Amino acid sequence: KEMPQPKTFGELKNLPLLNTDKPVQALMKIADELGEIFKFEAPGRVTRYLSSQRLIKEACDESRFDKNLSQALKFVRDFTGDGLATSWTHEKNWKKAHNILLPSFSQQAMKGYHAMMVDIAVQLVQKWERLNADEHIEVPEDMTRLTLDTIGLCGFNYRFNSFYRDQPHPFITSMVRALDEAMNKLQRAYDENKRQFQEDIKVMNDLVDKIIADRKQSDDLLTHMLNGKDPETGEPLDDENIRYQIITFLLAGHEVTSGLLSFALYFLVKNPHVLQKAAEEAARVLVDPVPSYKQVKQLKYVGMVLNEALRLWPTAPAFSLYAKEDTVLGGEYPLEKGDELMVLIPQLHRDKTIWGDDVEEFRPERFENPSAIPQHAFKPFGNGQRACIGQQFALHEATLVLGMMLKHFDFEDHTNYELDIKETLTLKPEGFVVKAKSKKIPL
Amino acid sequence: KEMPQPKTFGELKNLPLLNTDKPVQALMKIADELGEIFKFEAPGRVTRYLSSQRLIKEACDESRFDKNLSQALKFVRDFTGDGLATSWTHEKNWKKAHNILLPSFSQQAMKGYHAMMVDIAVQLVQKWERLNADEHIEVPEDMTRLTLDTIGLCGFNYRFNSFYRDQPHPFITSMVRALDEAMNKLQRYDENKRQFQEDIKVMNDLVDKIIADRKGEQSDDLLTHMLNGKDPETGEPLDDENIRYQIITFLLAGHEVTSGLLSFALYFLVKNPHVLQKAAEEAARVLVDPVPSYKQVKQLKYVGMVLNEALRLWPTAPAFSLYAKEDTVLGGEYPLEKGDELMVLIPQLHRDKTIWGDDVEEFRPERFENPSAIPQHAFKPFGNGQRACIGQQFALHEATLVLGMMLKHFDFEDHTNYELDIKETLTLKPEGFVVKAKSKKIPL
Ligand code: HEM
Ligand code: HEM
Ligand SMILES: Cc1ccc(N)cc1
Ligand SMILES: Cc1ccc(N)cc1
C-alpha cells in the first residue's frame, strides 16, 4: 500500500531524473528497480507511473479514468491546439472532430488511400534499386521521407517530394524545432529559445491556413473536414480547428509511424529466421508488380512483425490518465479525484506474467491469436475512445511498404548495428543503416 | 439492375423454399449464392431480401422506408394486436404507447428493475450449484426459465416460478402453441384453427384478469406505468385492450428472444476457451460483492462485448421488414415503387466482409471495443430507428448480469463436444445445447 519512489534531489524532488537525453528509457530502468508502480514528484506536479498489466487494465477503465494532458502534451498543444490529440475529452471540439473524422480513418476508407500510398512506396523502392554497389541506406531517414509524403498526399493532396530533397521541408523545420523546444521545457536566460518557438508557431499556422484557403474537391482528409458535419451537433469543424487537425496529423503521421518501420526493419535484420519467414510471405502474396489493398490484408506475418515491433519499442511510448472520482487502484493504492497516472508502454509490454520469460526476444508468433493475449496487455495505440484514430492508416502503410521491401530486396546489417534509441517525444533507432541488394524484380 | 431470384416451384413461385424447418438459415444460403439482394415471390406477395450494409443503410432511411408487418407479424398480430411490436407507425396506439412506455425502458429505469433481476438470477445460480456430480445443464431451457421469470416479475410482479416446474406455465403453453400455429401458416387444417382460437382466448383471459386484479397496488413495474401513464402528445392513457396487448407482447419478447442470446453467448464461450477465460477474469474482478450492483453490471465491458459478438453471429430476432414510403431507387440500380417490401436478413448483414473483414465467422468480441468505429447501420440486432427494440437496455442488462454471475460462480465444460443445431421458431435457439458446470464454491 506504500508506493515506491525513486531518488530525490532536495526541492527539485525527482525532476533531475528527467534531465537526460533518454528519459523514457531511464523511466524503464526505475520501473525495473521499483516494480509495477512508483510515484514521480516534481515542483507543482505529481504523477504515478504504471508498468504492469494488472494495474493498467484498471487504469484503462474509461468509467474511472479519462485521458489527461501530460506536461509534454500541454506544451505540444501550444501549436496543435484543441486538435484531436491535445484536446480534453470534455472539450466540444474533441467529440465533434472525432465524429467527423472517424469515417475517413476506417478500414473501409483505406481502399481510397491505397493508391496514394503505393505512389509513395514505389518511389522508395526505386530509390533503393537505383543505389550503387556498396552504397547504404539511412533507414529512419528514408522511412520518415515515406511516412511524411504519405500523410501529405492522403491528407491534403500535397506532395512534399521528400525523395527529391537532402534538406527537410520548410514547414517541418519549424515543426521539428517546435517539438524540440516542447521537450526541452520538461527537463528545465531561455528567452531566445522562447522567442523562436513563437516565430515557429507563426510559420506553421500561416502555411497551413493558406492550404485551407487554397482548397476553398478530392478524396483526402481536408475535403472530408471542409464538407463533413458532425451528426451529433449538426455543425462542421471551423477553419481554426481544421489546421489543428492538419498540424496534428502531419506531426503524428510522419515520425511516430516511421519509427515503427525502422524498428521493424532493425528487428528483422537481427533475427534472420523471422526476416526469411516474412520475406517468403511477401513473395507468395505480392504476385503483382503493384500490391493491391486486398493483398496487403493478406500479409499476416508482416502484420505480426509490426505488432512485435510495437511490443518491444512502441514509438508513442506513454500516455497520461486522470481519476474521474476517488478510487482505489488494485485494492491497495487509493487515489483522489484528479490524480494523474502515466502508462509506461515499453514496461507494460515486458510484463513477464503476460508474455512469459522471453520478453526481450523478437517472436512475431506471439500475435497469431488476438484472443490469447489478456485484456489491456498490448496498448501501442493508446486506449478507449481516446485511442489512436490513425491506427489503421499506420498499420496499412507499414504493412504495404514493408511487404514491398521484403519482396524486392535482400537485407544485410553490414555494420553490425548496435541499437541506439534517440528520444524526442517519440522513439527511433538512431544511425541504423543497412545495405539492400536488389532482387531485380520489375515494378 | 436485373435482380436475382432463387429456384421456383411452378405457380407456387418461391414459397416451398420456406417449407423447411430452418427458413432463416436457408435464406442465408440463398443470400450467399445470389449476393447482396434477391427477389422472393410467393402467391400474392413479393419481397426483396437485403444482406449488405451498402443497401441496408439506405433501407434504414426513415424518410424513405417505414416498418412493415411481415407475414409472420400479421399472424402474431392475431393475439398481440396493435401492441408496440405489431402496430403500424401511423396507427394512433403506436406513438401513444411508445411515448408512455419509453421512460420505463430507459437506462435510468434499469436501476429499479435491477433488484428483481438479481432475484431471478440468484435462483439460476442456486439451481446449478445444487446439481450433483456428472449432472448436466440444459442451457436454452434454463435461460428461458430465467428470461420468462425476469419479465414476469419486472413487468407485472408475477412469479411464473419457472424453476419449480418441469412442464411450462399454462399461459406460455397456449402462447407457444399460438406461435407454432402462426409459423405453420407461413409454409401452408380446420382443427388447428379451433385450438388457435382456444389458445388466443386463454391468453386474453389470464391477462385481462391480471389487469383487472391490479386495479390499486403501486409497484415499480410496467403494469403500473401503463395504468397511470398519460401520453404527453394526446394527453390520453392506454385503454385496457391495448394494455393486455403490450403484456402479451412483452411476455413473448421477454422469454424466447433474450434467452437465445444467453444460450448462444454461452455456446460461443465454451467453443473459444480463450474468450471465456478472458470474460471470467473480468467477472471475477468486477463482481466483488455476493450480490451484483447495478453499477458493477455497467462495468463488465468485455461481457457486454461477448454478448454483442453473439448478437452479430446469431441475432435471435433475425429479420425485420420495411416498405417504401414513395417511389425511390435502392443503391442507384434497383427502382422501387411505393409500397414495395424489403426484408433485412440480419445474420447476413452482420457477415458483410466489406465491413468486418474476412474472419466474419470467427467469434472475436474485440470487434466491439469502440462502438463508434463500426460504420453506420452495420450492426442492427435490435432493429432500426424509432421502430427499434424498446427493450434493448432491459435485455442487455439482464444478459450482462446473468452471464457475469455464471462466469463468476462456475467453470463450464462442453462435455459432449456439442455440434451446433439451431432450432427456428420465430426466433433462434441452439437446440439441445448442454454443458456441465463445476462450481467455484463462492457464496451468495
Ligand atoms: C505506428 C504509428 C502510431 C502509433 C504507435 C500511434 C500511437 C498513438 C497513441 C499511443 C495515442 C494516444 C496518446 C494518448 O493517449 O495521449 C495516439 C493518438 C492519436 N493518434 Fe496516433 N499513432 C500512430 C500513428 C498515427 C497516425 C498515422 C495518425 C494520423 C495521421 C495518428 C493520429 C492520432 C490522433 C489524431 C490521435 C488522438 C485521437 C484522439 O484523441 O481522439 N497517429 N496515437
Ligand atoms: C436480445 C434480445 C432482443 C433482441 C435481439 C430484440 C430484437 C428486436 C428487433 C430486431 C426489433 C424490431 C423488429 C421489427 O422491426 O419488426 C425489436 C422490437 C421490439 N422489441 Fe425487442 N429484442 C430483444 C429483447 C426484447 C425485450 C426483452 C423486450 C421487452 C420485454 C422487447 C420488446 C420489443 C418491442 C416492444 C419491440 C417493438 C417496438 C416498436 O415497434 O416500437 N425486446 N426487438
Ligand atoms: C501522444 C501521441 C503520440 C503519437 C501520436 N500519433 C498521437 C499522440
Ligand atoms: C418482431 C419482434 C422481434 C423481437 C421482439 N423482441 C419483438 C418483436
Method: X-ray
Compute how many other C-beta atoms are within 10 angstroms of the C-beta atom of residue B1.
6
Q: What burial letters (b/e) apply to B221-232, b meaning 16+ CB within 10 Å?
A: bbbbbbbebebe
Q: Which residue of A has its CA nearest to B363?
A: A371
Burial environment of residue A159 by CB neighbours within 10 A (0 to 12, 13 to 18, 19 or more)? exposed
Task: Compute the distance between CA of residue B66 and CA of residue B325 in angstroms, rounded to an integer.
Answer: 7
Q: How many residues does chain A have?
A: 443
Q: What secondary structure letter does DSSP report for A419?
A: P
Task: Compute the distance between CA of residue B400 and CA of residue A439 in angstroms, rounded to an integer.
Answer: 56
The end-to-end CA distance of chain A, in Å, is 61
Task: Compute the distance between CA of residue A147 and CA of residue B87 in angstroms, rounded to an integer.
Answer: 56
Helical (H) or strand (E) element with A37:
strand A37-42
Q: State whether A99 and B372 contact (CB < 8 Å).
A: yes
Task: Compute the distance between CA of residue B115 and CA of residue B121 in angstroms, rounded to an integer.
Answer: 10
Q: What are phi and psi of A412, to 5 degrees?
A: -140, 125
- CA A142 to chain centroid, in Å, comes to 16
Q: How many residues does chain B have?
A: 444
Q: What is the distance in A from the centroid of ligand 4 to the CA of B2?
A: 32
Within B264-416, strands assigned E span 319-324, 328-330, 334-336, 341-345, 410-413
- Is B303:B279 a contact under the CB 8 Å cutoff? yes
Residue among A388, A391, A425 whose CB has most ligand 1 atoms within 8 A, to mutate: A388
For residue A320, the cross-strand partners are A68, A342
For residue A137, the cross-strand partners are A434
- Is A329:A58 a contact under the CB 8 Å cutoff? yes
Look at ligand 4, atom 5, and give the residue with the nearest C-alpha: B253
Q: What burial letters (b/e) apply to A429-439, b meaning 16+ CB within 10 Å?
A: beebebbbeee
Q: CA quadruple B350, B353, B355, B357: dihedral positive or negative? A: positive
Task: Compute the distance between CA of residue A254 and CA of residue A53 in angstroms, rounded to an integer.
Answer: 29
Q: What secondary structure letter does DSSP report for B254?
A: I
For chain B, the residues whose C-beta falls within 8 A of a C-beta of chain A are: 272, 274-275, 278, 281-282, 298-299, 302, 354-355, 357-358, 364, 366, 370, 372-373, 375
- CA A393 to chain centroid, in Å, comes to 11
Q: How far is A103 from chain B (nearest CA, A)?
A: 7
Residue A264 near ligand 3, beta carbon < 6 Å: no
Residue A263 makes CB contacts below 8 A (sequence gap 6+) with A309, A312, A313, A315, A427, A429
Burial environment of residue B169 by CB neighbours within 10 A (0 to 12, 13 to 18, 19 or more)? buried
The end-to-end CA distance of chain B, in Å, is 61
- Quote the crossing angle between the two packed helices A391-408 and A239-270, to the nearest 10°: 40
Alpha carbon distances (Å) from B192 to B25, B173, B174, B199, B427: 26, 15, 13, 10, 21
Q: What secondary structure letter does DSSP report for B256?
A: I
Residue written as grid cell 524526442? A424
Strand B410-413's sheet: what is its strand order? Answer: B137-138, B434-439, B410-413
The amino acid that residue B412 corresponds to is: F
The amino acid that residue B76 corresponds to is: V
* C-alpha cell belonging to residue B358: 474476412
Q: What are phi and psi of A2, to 5 degrees?
A: -85, 130
DSSP calls for B211-235: HHHH-----SSHHHHHHH---TTT-
Q: How far is B323 from chain A (nearest CA, A)?
A: 25
The amino acid that residue A80 corresponds to is: T
Task: Compute the distance between CA of residue B17 and CA of residue B40 in angstroms, rounded to an integer.
Answer: 10
Q: State whether A371 and B274 contact (CB < 8 Å).
A: yes
Residue A166 makes CB contacts below 8 A (sequence gap 6+) with none
For A387, which of B272, B357, B370 is closest by C-beta distance?
B370
Q: State whether B364 and A375 contact (CB < 8 Å).
A: no
Helical (H) or strand (E) element with A434:
strand A433-438
* C-alpha cell belonging to residue A220: 483526402
Residue A314 makes CB contacts below 8 A (sequence gap 6+) with A345, A346, A349, A380, A427
Q: Which atom of ligand 4 is nearest to the CA of B249?
A: 7
Q: Which of B107, B271, B274 to mutate to test the interface with A (most CBs of A within 10 A)?
A: B274
Q: How far is B370 from chain A (nearest CA, A)?
A: 6
Please indicate if the annotation marks B389 as binding a ligand.
yes
Q: Helix, strand, coil proportions of chain A in percent (round to 5)?
A: 55, 10, 35
Chain A residues inside the 8 Å CB shell of B302 = 375
* C-alpha cell belonging to residue A25: 528509457
Q: Give the resolution to one decimal, in Å.
A: 2.3
The helix/strand/coil state of A256 is helix
Helical (H) or strand (E) element with A55:
helix A53-59
Q: State whether B354 and A108 contact (CB < 8 Å).
A: yes
Nearest to A120 by CA among A169, A95, A155: A155
- CA B239 to chain centroid, in Å, comes to 26
Nearest to B384 by CA among B320, B312, B340: B320
Residue written as grid cell 432463416? B24
Q: CA quadruple B173, B176, B180, B185: dihedral positive or negative? A: positive
Within B92-221, strands assigned E span 137-138
Residue B442 makes CB contacts below 8 A (sequence gap 6+) with B408, B409
For B375, which of A61, A106, A371 is closest by C-beta distance?
A106
Look at ligand 3, atom 7, and give the residue with the nearest C-alpha: A252
Residue B316 near ligand 2, beta carbon < 6 Å: yes
Nearest to A386 by CA among A95, A179, A120: A95
Q: What burial letters (b/e) apply to B302-341, b meaning 16+ CB within 10 Å?
A: bbbbbbbbbbbebbbbbbbbbbbeeebebeeebebeeebb
Task: Name all contacts of B362-366 with Cβ < 8 Å and 24+ positions apart.
Answer: B363/B268, B363/B271, B363/B272, B363/B275, B363/B309, B363/B310, B363/B313, B364/A370, B364/A371, B364/B275, B364/B309, B365/B275, B365/B279, B365/B302, B365/B305, B365/B306, B365/B308, B365/B309, B366/A370, B366/A371, B366/B305
- Is B287:B443 a contact under the CB 8 Å cutoff? no
Q: What are phi and psi of A340, to 5 degrees?
A: -105, 145
